[PDB]
Design an enzyme around this catalytic site. Structure first.
Site, mmCIF file in Angstrom:
data_model
loop_
_atom_site.group_PDB
_atom_site.id
_atom_site.type_symbol
_atom_site.label_atom_id
_atom_site.label_comp_id
_atom_site.label_asym_id
_atom_site.label_seq_id
_atom_site.Cartn_x
_atom_site.Cartn_y
_atom_site.Cartn_z
ATOM 1 N N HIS A 133 6.645 6.919 5.767
ATOM 2 C CA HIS A 133 6.441 5.870 4.766
ATOM 3 C C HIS A 133 6.982 6.300 3.400
ATOM 4 O O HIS A 133 7.416 5.452 2.623
ATOM 5 C CB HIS A 133 4.953 5.504 4.630
ATOM 6 C CG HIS A 133 4.269 5.144 5.914
ATOM 7 N ND1 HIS A 133 4.672 4.114 6.734
ATOM 8 C CD2 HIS A 133 3.188 5.732 6.507
ATOM 9 C CE1 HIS A 133 3.873 4.073 7.800
ATOM 10 N NE2 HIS A 133 2.946 5.066 7.679
ATOM 11 N N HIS A 144 4.583 11.794 -4.442
ATOM 12 C CA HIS A 144 5.510 11.146 -3.517
ATOM 13 C C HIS A 144 6.197 10.007 -4.249
ATOM 14 O O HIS A 144 6.015 9.853 -5.458
ATOM 15 C CB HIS A 144 4.798 10.591 -2.278
ATOM 16 C CG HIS A 144 3.722 9.621 -2.630
ATOM 17 N ND1 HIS A 144 2.436 9.996 -2.948
ATOM 18 C CD2 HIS A 144 3.811 8.265 -2.766
ATOM 19 C CE1 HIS A 144 1.743 8.896 -3.259
ATOM 20 N NE2 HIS A 144 2.586 7.806 -3.156
ATOM 21 N N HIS A 162 8.233 5.874 -4.301
ATOM 22 C CA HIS A 162 8.472 4.512 -3.863
ATOM 23 C C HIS A 162 9.832 4.079 -4.394
ATOM 24 O O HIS A 162 10.139 4.312 -5.559
ATOM 25 C CB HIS A 162 7.337 3.579 -4.311
ATOM 26 C CG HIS A 162 6.002 3.943 -3.718
ATOM 27 N ND1 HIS A 162 5.426 3.345 -2.620
ATOM 28 C CD2 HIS A 162 5.196 4.975 -4.067
ATOM 29 C CE1 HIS A 162 4.272 3.959 -2.343
ATOM 30 N NE2 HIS A 162 4.122 4.993 -3.228
ATOM 31 N N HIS A 166 4.408 8.966 -7.840
ATOM 32 C CA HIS A 166 2.963 8.912 -7.961
ATOM 33 C C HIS A 166 2.448 10.331 -7.769
ATOM 34 O O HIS A 166 2.670 10.923 -6.719
ATOM 35 C CB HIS A 166 2.359 7.943 -6.935
ATOM 36 C CG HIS A 166 2.685 6.479 -7.126
ATOM 37 N ND1 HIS A 166 2.808 5.578 -6.096
ATOM 38 C CD2 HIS A 166 2.839 5.758 -8.281
ATOM 39 C CE1 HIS A 166 3.061 4.372 -6.601
ATOM 40 N NE2 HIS A 166 3.069 4.448 -7.952
ATOM 41 N N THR A 206 -1.964 2.054 -2.897
ATOM 42 C CA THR A 206 -0.998 0.998 -2.658
ATOM 43 C C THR A 206 -0.620 0.980 -1.181
ATOM 44 O O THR A 206 0.241 0.214 -0.766
ATOM 45 C CB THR A 206 0.210 1.158 -3.583
ATOM 46 O OG1 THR A 206 1.007 2.252 -3.149
ATOM 47 C CG2 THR A 206 -0.189 1.406 -5.021
ATOM 48 N N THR A 207 -1.268 1.844 -0.392
ATOM 49 C CA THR A 207 -1.040 1.944 1.042
ATOM 50 C C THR A 207 -2.393 1.762 1.723
ATOM 51 O O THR A 207 -3.421 1.998 1.083
ATOM 52 C CB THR A 207 -0.380 3.286 1.417
ATOM 53 O OG1 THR A 207 -1.160 4.367 0.897
ATOM 54 C CG2 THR A 207 1.033 3.433 0.887
HETATM 55 N N1 TBW Z 1 0.904 4.773 -2.853
HETATM 56 S S1 TBW Z 1 -0.283 5.738 -3.647
HETATM 57 O O1 TBW Z 1 0.387 6.506 -4.696
HETATM 58 O O2 TBW Z 1 -1.344 5.002 -4.350
HETATM 59 C C1 TBW Z 1 -1.307 6.760 -2.549
HETATM 60 N N2 TBW Z 1 -1.710 7.982 -2.814
HETATM 61 N N3 TBW Z 1 -2.499 8.593 -1.913
HETATM 62 C C2 TBW Z 1 -2.760 7.894 -0.834
HETATM 63 N N4 TBW Z 1 -3.576 8.378 0.265
HETATM 64 C C3 TBW Z 1 -3.921 9.798 0.227
HETATM 65 O O3 TBW Z 1 -3.553 10.498 -0.667
HETATM 66 C C4 TBW Z 1 -4.814 10.402 1.289
HETATM 67 C C5 TBW Z 1 -6.045 11.020 0.602
HETATM 68 C C6 TBW Z 1 -6.607 10.393 -0.709
HETATM 69 C C7 TBW Z 1 -7.382 9.225 -0.671
HETATM 70 C C8 TBW Z 1 -7.912 8.675 -1.838
HETATM 71 C C9 TBW Z 1 -7.661 9.294 -3.060
HETATM 72 C C10 TBW Z 1 -6.900 10.468 -3.113
HETATM 73 C C11 TBW Z 1 -6.393 11.020 -1.940
HETATM 74 S S2 TBW Z 1 -2.025 6.363 -1.041
HETATM 75 ZN ZN ZN Z 2 2.266 5.892 -3.980
#
Ligand code: TBW
Ligand code: ZN
Length: 222
Positions: free
Chosen positions: A62, A88, A90, A107, A173-174
């Site tokens: 992703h 990571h 986008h 992010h 956002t996921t």
């Molecule tokens: N697209 S994004 O930048 O918002 C995302 N970043 N982290 C995601 N999921 C994780 O990191 C798995 C663990 C986790 C869950 C909740 C808080 C912090 C870490 S989506």
């Molecule tokens: Zn993100």
């Protein structure tokens, strides 16, 4: 459960895919957002304490994710300390500024002692190739595996010296689109090439940008 950006998987459908993913469609404080009307305010300053670390670089099908097994890369804001877990990207960006979409978004994902989430976002404009990211783009896996601690990286390089930010609250956002997340979006933009963005897209397999969600009762601070 399988999720993605096209076909039946798509963001409009994430809520239908699983009961665990239902907040993606039901919830009222979701990211990302179009930042337009903002209340001007006295936000606390960000202090960044990042440093050369050993990181693990993953393609999770992703996004491309630079993971930090160890702490020591921190951000202090309003007396709380948040540990950088991973960052990571986008392509294109998820958030917008007055309707403006950018070729890429980073992010930087943190946790404090209390387990409070905080994402800090860098938007990248069209411009020069990004030198500082090339370390990552070279070792970037183009399939669902990981390139391990053969990889030093200094995330200091990826943040500007001007640390003015927009502040609101929202979600991942996921899926499962967990709310509870503090968003700081930096006002100063970095830069990428077209060749760098497509390489990301090639590697991840698609454009990984969730559409903007209504702000609803939420206020963005400038
Ligand atoms: N697209 S994004 O930048 O918002 C995302 N970043 N982290 C995601 N999921 C994780 O990191 C798995 C663990 C986790 C869950 C909740 C808080 C912090 C870490 S989506
Ligand atoms: Zn993100």
């Amino acid at each position: 459960t399988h999720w993605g950006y096209t076909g039946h998987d798509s963001p409009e459908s994430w809520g239908n895919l699983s009961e665990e993913f239902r907040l993606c469609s039901t919830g009222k404080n979701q990211s990302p957002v179009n930042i337009t009307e903002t209340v001007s305010g006295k936000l606390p300053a960000i202090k960044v304490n990042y440093k050369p670390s050993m990181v693990d670089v993953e393609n999770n099908g992703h996004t491309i994710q630079v993971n930090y097994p160890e702490g020591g890369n921190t951000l202090t804001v309003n007396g709380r300390t948040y540990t950088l877990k991973q960052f990571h990207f986008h392509v294109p960006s998820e958030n917008q500024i007055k309707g403006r979409t950018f070729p890429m978004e980073a992010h930087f994902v943190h946790l404090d002692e209390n387990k409070q989430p905080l994402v800090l976002a860098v938007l990248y404009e069209a411009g020069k190739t990004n030198g500082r990211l090339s370390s990552i783009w070279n070792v970037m896996p183009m399939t669902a595996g990981k390139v391990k601690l053969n990889q030093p990286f200094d995330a200091s390089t990826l943040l500007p010296k001007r640390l003015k930010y927009y502040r609101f609250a929202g979600s991942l956002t996921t899926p499962p689109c967990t709310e509870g997340v503090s968003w700081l979006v930096l006002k100063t933009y970095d830069h990428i090439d077209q060749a760098q963005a497509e390489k990301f897209t090639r590697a991840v397999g698609s454009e990984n940008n969730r559409p903007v969600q209504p702000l609803n009762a939420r206020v963005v601070i400038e």
